[PDB]
Structure formats: structure tokens, C-alpha cells
Design a protein around this ligand. Structure first.
Ligand SMILES: C[C@H]1C(=O)CC[C@@]2(C)[C@H]3CC=C4[C@H]5CC(C)(C)CC[C@@]5(C(=O)O)CC[C@@]4(C)[C@@]3(C)CC[C@@H]12
Lengths: 12, 210
């Protein structure tokens, strides 16, 4: 899904 | 040699590279999942901080990340378990086909032998990350644009640590290139361990595309 990766990137 | 925006850049990278670190467990050598998971966590944190990465297309960003992973992990493993054990592995016993083990350790020993400084590791990782060559990138140039400055700085600090041997920089990219070629066997290597009912964390499936 790459969704955890997505959260981890845009996360502040 | 190194100036003036090329000091602000190295600094800024060293800064980011250094504020993620492997705690505690570089001691007790299952746990292999923790290590793997630590590696990724740290990688994305380093990745996202990298100059310009904010601006990159999202689908490129993820691609850049998934492709860089196997090399970064070899690189970040090395920078730790060659310094912190100044061999011994758990991976035979983890039920990996020996086909893949003896090869993939050549690559590990090879990297340690380069004997890189921690500015070399840091910058090289960054180059590895922002490789425009990776699969499913669309804006290869936009990636390529961010990689140029890191390259031409790394270049110089190979002439600095050290001049003696002038094939150092070339020899650094070489080993990484050598490793890129292993990436399709690493896929299989992993899909080999996932046959016997053994599973990965959701994160580790995402990073390795499982
Ligand atoms: C046994 C299996 C596991 O349980 C989950 C983690 C995983 C997939 C993983 C954990 C750590 C490494 C590192 C081990 C070394 C050999 C140090 C090099 C980097 C390397 C990496 O993280 O990319 C390569 C293999 C893997 C990915 C490898 C194959 C070793 C055992 C392996």
C-alpha cells in the first residue's frame, strides 16, 4: 500500500 | 577545496544524518525484525530532511525510498557492526537459503573494506537515496538536479580523506553499483524466507514491496 511510508514522510 | 555553500550543505546533512541513531540493541547483535524496522524508520527520517525532497512528486518520493532501501541498509549496517564490533550472524539460522547468504556477505565485507568516514557514509547514502535511475520515477531530471550537489561535494571529500589513493571515489560508486545488481536476488531471498510460514511487519512489506 505504501501508506505507512506516506505517513512517515509527511508527519511533522 | 570545500566552499561555501558546500560547507553549509555538508553540515546540514551531517546534522540530519547524525540525529538518528541505533540505540541499545547493538549489543544483543525475532530481534532481526527490530533492526530491520529501526533501519527503515531512520532511513525515512533522513530521507525526508534531504534538501529538495519535500518538492518531489509523491509517487517519485516513494519510489526513491523503496529502491534505496537495500543499499542503505547494507550501508547503515556497515557503519554500525564494523565500528561497534571492532561476524557474528543470525541469518544462517533464520532459514535463508545459503544460495543468498555467502553472496550477500561478500558485499558486506567489501563495504567495510572501503573504510569510509562518517561524512562519506552520510553523503553516499544520500546519493543512493536520490538515484534518478530508479524504477517508476517520472521526473528523472528533478531527482537528478538534487543529486548533482551531493555528488560533487562527496567527490572532493574523497580527495581529502584521503589523496594517497586517487581511485577512492570511483571505487565507492563501484561497490554500490556492484550491489544494485544484487537487488533482484534480494527479492527472491526474501520471498524464500516468506515461504515457510514466516511473516514481516506491515512496514517491512511496504518497504520491500511484498
Ligand atoms: C530472517 C529475516 C527476518 O526474520 C526479518 C529480517 C530479514 C528479512 C532481514 C534483516 C536485516 C538484513 C540486513 C543484514 C546484513 C547482512 C547485515 C546486511 C543488510 C541487510 C539489510 O537490512 O538490507 C540484508 C539482509 C536483511 C534485510 C535480512 C534479510 C536478514 C534476515 C531477515
Amino acid at each position: 500500500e505504501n501508506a505507512l511510508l506516506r505517513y512517515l514522510l509527511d508527519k511533522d | 577545496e570545500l566552499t561555501p555553500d558546500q560547507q553549509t550543505l555538508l553540515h546540514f546533512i551531517m546534522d540530519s544524518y547524525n540525529k538518528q541513531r541505533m540505540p541499545q540493541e547493538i549489543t544483543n547483535k525475532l530481534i532481526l525484525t527490530e533492526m530491520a524496522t529501526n533501519h527503515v524508520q531512520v532511513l525515512v527520517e533522513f530521507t525526508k530532511k534531504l534538501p529538495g525532497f519535500q518538492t518531489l512528486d509523491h509517487e517519485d518520493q516513494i519510489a526513491l525510498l523503496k529502491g534505496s532501501a537495500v543499499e542503505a541498509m547494507f550501508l547503515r549496517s556497515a557503519e554500525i557492526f564494523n565500528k561497534k564490533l571492532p561476524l557474528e550472524e543470525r541469518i544462517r539460522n533464520s532459514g535463508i537459503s545459503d544460495e543468498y547468504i555467502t553472496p550477500m556477505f561478500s558485499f558486506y565485507k567489501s563495504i567495510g573494506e572501503l573504510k569510509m568516514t562518517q561524512e562519506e557514509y552520510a553523503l553516499l547514502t544520500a546519493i543512493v537515496i536520490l538515484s534518478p535511475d530508479r524504477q517508476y520515477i517520472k521526473d528523472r531530471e528533478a531527482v537528478e538536479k538534487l543529486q548533482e550537489p551531493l555528488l560533487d561535494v562527496l567527490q572532493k571529500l574523497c580527495k581529502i580523506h584521503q589523496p594517497e589513493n586517487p581511485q577512492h571515489f570511483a571505487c565507492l560508486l563501484g561497490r554500490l553499483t556492484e550491489l544494485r545488481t544484487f537487488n533482484h536476488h534480494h527479492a527472491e531471498m526474501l520471498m524464500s524466507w516468506r515461504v515457510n510460514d514466516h511473516k514481516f511487519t506491515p512496514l517491512l512489506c511496504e518497504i520491500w514491496d511484498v
